[PDB]
C-alpha cells in the first residue's frame, strides 16, 4: 500500500509529458527531474540504459 | 558489519558446527592468544572473530591445529 | 448540500487544496483532500505498559 | 464542540449525569469554582420561605481508571437561567454538548513512510499547545488500623526518612499539599506498635545509630513506586466519633 | 559568473496589526523558492524568544486546586498566560507582579509597566474579578531563550528543590505562527529572468520583522562555516 | 544520576549488540528475531516495515 | 543563542568520481536546510563550459542518418554532451573533428588550443565508422548556466553543472543530551572534470555572497 503504490506511480507511462522525447543518459534524468520541467510519467522515450 | 555468514556457509560445509567454531574462536580472541587483525571500528571481539571467519582465515581445522599447538607448547 | 457549504466559504467544491512540501518545499501533484475531523484518544498508552 | 455532529448529543449531554442541571433557576448571583448561587424567582416560587438552590460542583476529583473530574463554570453574574439547561460544563461536556474529542487539521498523505498501515502523524504544534492532555489521579490508599497488635497513630514521626521527605513534612505525618514526587519518596507513612512480642534487641544498636523513632517497631511506610510521579491534591483520610489530635486530618 | 544581483529589503507594509509584507524585488533564475524554503524553516525552527516560564502565586499551594472570587481555574489561567506575548530588551529573566481587586475583567496592561517590559496587547483575557474579594498576586517570570524546551529538561541539571507554590509553565513561545510566500513577476525592461517574493510574518508585536529576517539571515550565514575555510583532521 | 560517561558507555554498548524481539502470541517460528538497537527519544520502540 | 561547531572527519572517499561527505553533529531540523540549499545552489544554477551546439555537415533535417556514420547518428550527440572541456580565457570557441580509418574516435585527436583542455582522451565520440575517412563537424561551446531542454533551432542541451546526481541523507546523532539531531550525508556524483569538494565550496560561496546584502548591519562576529 505504500512502496508498491510509489513504484506504481513513478513507473506508470502516460502521454503529454513536459519536454517530450529527450535523449539523455542514466543518472542525468535525476538531474533533470529534481529542478523543474519534467514529469515522472514520460512515455515512449528512448534513453541510455546499461 | 557481520550481517550474514553466507561465505562460511559456502566454505564450511555445515553451519551448525560453525556456531561452535565461532564461539571457540571468540573466547580465544577475548581472553588471549592472538592479536586482533581487524581494527575495532564499532565492533566487539565476537564480531571481529565472525568477520575473520567471513574473510576465510579460520575454520574447524585451523582452530584444531591452534588448540593442538597451544596444548603442545605447555 | 455539502458542496454548497464548501463553495460558500471560499473553498473549492472538490474539497481538495494543493499542498506544498515541508522537507523539500516543492509543489505536489493533483490536489489533496484536507479538512478538520473529530478525533479521540484511547486509554492504552506507553506509560502504563513500559 | 463537534463540527461534524449528530443532533442527539444534546439529549446525551443533558442526561449524562455529571452536569449542573437547572431547577426553578433564574439570575445567577455569584459564579465561583464549586460555588454558584441563584436568585429566587418570583413567578415560579415555593411557599417554604423562598429556598435557594445552590449546586456544589465536584471539581478535580478522582474517577475510575485514573481520570480527573472537573466542573467548568459556564454562566456569569447577572443572566437569567431557565429550566432544563446546564449551568456548569463537566469533563468534555463543553457548552452543554458532549465533546469528548477534538478537531485538528487532517491531510490525507502517505508522507515519508511515517504513516505505514493506517498510523497517525502528530507534529510539534499539538505538543506545544498541550491538546489531548489529561490528568491521571492515582489512588494510594493504605490501612493503619485494627491489626493484631493494637491501636496506631498516624506515622508517629517514622524513621528511615529522607532529606526531601524532611523538606516535605511540615510537622508530622502526611506531607504538605503540593509537594513533588520523584522516584522513591515517602508519601504515606505508618507504624505498627506491638503489645506482646519480642522487642528484637539485635537492631537496638541501629536504634542508637539511625532513626528518630525507636527502631523496635519495624514499620514499612508506603512509598511511591517506580512509574508514578506528580503532585497531590487533597487530604480526606477519615471521619469518626471521638476525634483525636490529628495534626493533618 | 559575476553574480552582482543582490536582494534588498524594500517597502515593508503593515495591514492590520501583525503581519508585515516584506518584499524582495531583486531575485535570480531559481533562487526565490530556495531562499523562501530556507528562510521559513530556519525562522520557524530556531530563533530567540521570551515568554512565561514559571509563576509564583501568593495564596495557593499547587496548580490543581482552585481560587475563590474568579471564574477561571488556576491551571486554565496558567495555560492562558502561556499564550501571553511580551517582549524584553534589557535582560533575560524578568519577574513581574500583578495586583488588582474589584469587579470586572482584567487586562494585560494591568501589570507594572517597566523600562524592560513593553506590553503590546491591551485585550488579553486572564481570570475575572467576581464580587468584592479576589486577592490575586502572581509573580510571572519571563525568560529570554530559544525553541521549545519541556519542564522535565528544566528540572534536569538544576538541583534547587523549589518551595511549594512555584508553578512551572511549559515553554510555548511561538513567535511566528504562519509564513505565506509566493513568486511574482518582477519589473519590466530587464533580462527577463528577475522575480520577486513577498513574505508575511505573524510576529504579533513582539519581534520586529526586519530584525527577524536579519536574524534568519544571520543564522543561515553562521551555520555554513564547516565549508570553504576548511581544515584537516 | 545520568552523567555523560554512562551515556557514552550506553552508546558504545547499544551500537553493537543483538536484541531479540517477539510477540506474546507466537504461533510462527518467525516471531523471535534479533536486531540492533538505537537510542531514540521517547519510550516506544519502532518495528521495521519489512518485519 | 549558543550553537555547536562539528569537529570530525570531512572527506574520506575515492577522489576520482565518488563523493560522500559527513556532517556530524548539527541541530534538530537543519540537515534538510543545508541539503535543500546546496541542491538548488549547485544543481540548477552553476556555471560550466559544456557543449552547446553541434553542426554536422550534410543533412540539416531530422536524425541525420547515412551521412558518414553507421550504427547511430544520435549516440555521438550523447557522447559530446558527456564531454566537458573547460574554457579559461575566451567565452565561446568552436572545435573541429578529424578522423581517419575504422575504429573509435579518440578524444586526443581533436585539435586543441591554449584555452581548450580535454579532461580525458578516453572519451569515445563515435565507435563504428565503416569508411576510410570521416566528415568534420563544428562543436561550439559556451559558458552559460541554466540547464534547460533546448528549443532553439540552427541543438543539444547545453549542460551547466558537471555533476550528474545529487541526494542527501539525514541521520540521528549521538550527542549526550540532544538525541534527535542531523547527520548530513551528501551523496553526489561528478563526471570527473572538477573535484567535488571544490564544487561544494563553489555552492558554499554562492550561498555566502548571495546573503551579503542582509548581514551588513549589524556585523556578524
PDB file of C-alpha atoms in Angstrom, chain C residues 17 19 21 23 28 32-41 43 45 47-48, chain D residues 2 4 65 98-109 111-112 120 132:
ATOM      1  CA  UNK C  17      -6.358  22.057  -1.767  1.00  0.00           C
ATOM      2  CA  UNK C  19      -0.243  21.348  -0.653  1.00  0.00           C
ATOM      3  CA  UNK C  21       6.241  20.157   0.994  1.00  0.00           C
ATOM      4  CA  UNK C  23      11.037  18.988   3.847  1.00  0.00           C
ATOM      5  CA  UNK C  28       2.973  18.256  -5.058  1.00  0.00           C
ATOM      6  CA  UNK C  32      -5.246  16.704  -1.705  1.00  0.00           C
ATOM      7  CA  UNK C  33      -8.363  16.433   0.455  1.00  0.00           C
ATOM      8  CA  UNK C  34      -7.685  18.330   3.689  1.00  0.00           C
ATOM      9  CA  UNK C  35     -10.082  19.092   6.498  1.00  0.00           C
ATOM     10  CA  UNK C  36     -10.902  19.038  10.201  1.00  0.00           C
ATOM     11  CA  UNK C  37     -12.435  15.879  11.666  1.00  0.00           C
ATOM     12  CA  UNK C  38     -13.453  14.686  15.144  1.00  0.00           C
ATOM     13  CA  UNK C  39     -10.699  12.589  16.740  1.00  0.00           C
ATOM     14  CA  UNK C  40     -10.188  10.864  20.084  1.00  0.00           C
ATOM     15  CA  UNK C  41      -7.538   9.462  22.447  1.00  0.00           C
ATOM     16  CA  UNK C  43      -6.869   4.710  27.432  1.00  0.00           C
ATOM     17  CA  UNK C  45      -0.664   4.285  26.124  1.00  0.00           C
ATOM     18  CA  UNK C  47       3.228   4.993  30.448  1.00  0.00           C
ATOM     19  CA  UNK C  48       1.223   2.005  31.761  1.00  0.00           C
TER      20      UNK C  48
ATOM     21  CA  UNK D   2     -18.298  18.516  17.222  1.00  0.00           C
ATOM     22  CA  UNK D   4     -19.435  17.032  12.470  1.00  0.00           C
ATOM     23  CA  UNK D  65      -9.354   4.326  35.568  1.00  0.00           C
ATOM     24  CA  UNK D  98     -20.934  16.129  24.514  1.00  0.00           C
ATOM     25  CA  UNK D  99     -17.487  16.796  23.062  1.00  0.00           C
ATOM     26  CA  UNK D 100     -15.069  14.035  24.085  1.00  0.00           C
ATOM     27  CA  UNK D 101     -12.775  14.601  21.095  1.00  0.00           C
ATOM     28  CA  UNK D 102     -11.159  17.499  19.229  1.00  0.00           C
ATOM     29  CA  UNK D 103     -10.710  18.983  15.755  1.00  0.00           C
ATOM     30  CA  UNK D 104      -7.257  19.275  14.188  1.00  0.00           C
ATOM     31  CA  UNK D 105      -6.058  19.614  10.603  1.00  0.00           C
ATOM     32  CA  UNK D 106      -6.115  16.363   8.619  1.00  0.00           C
ATOM     33  CA  UNK D 107      -4.197  15.941   5.353  1.00  0.00           C
ATOM     34  CA  UNK D 108      -4.549  12.582   3.581  1.00  0.00           C
ATOM     35  CA  UNK D 109      -0.956  11.886   2.524  1.00  0.00           C
ATOM     36  CA  UNK D 111       4.345  11.060   3.987  1.00  0.00           C
ATOM     37  CA  UNK D 112       7.935   9.769   4.348  1.00  0.00           C
ATOM     38  CA  UNK D 120      -1.155   8.638  12.925  1.00  0.00           C
ATOM     39  CA  UNK D 132      -5.325  15.956  24.398  1.00  0.00           C
TER      40      UNK D 132
END
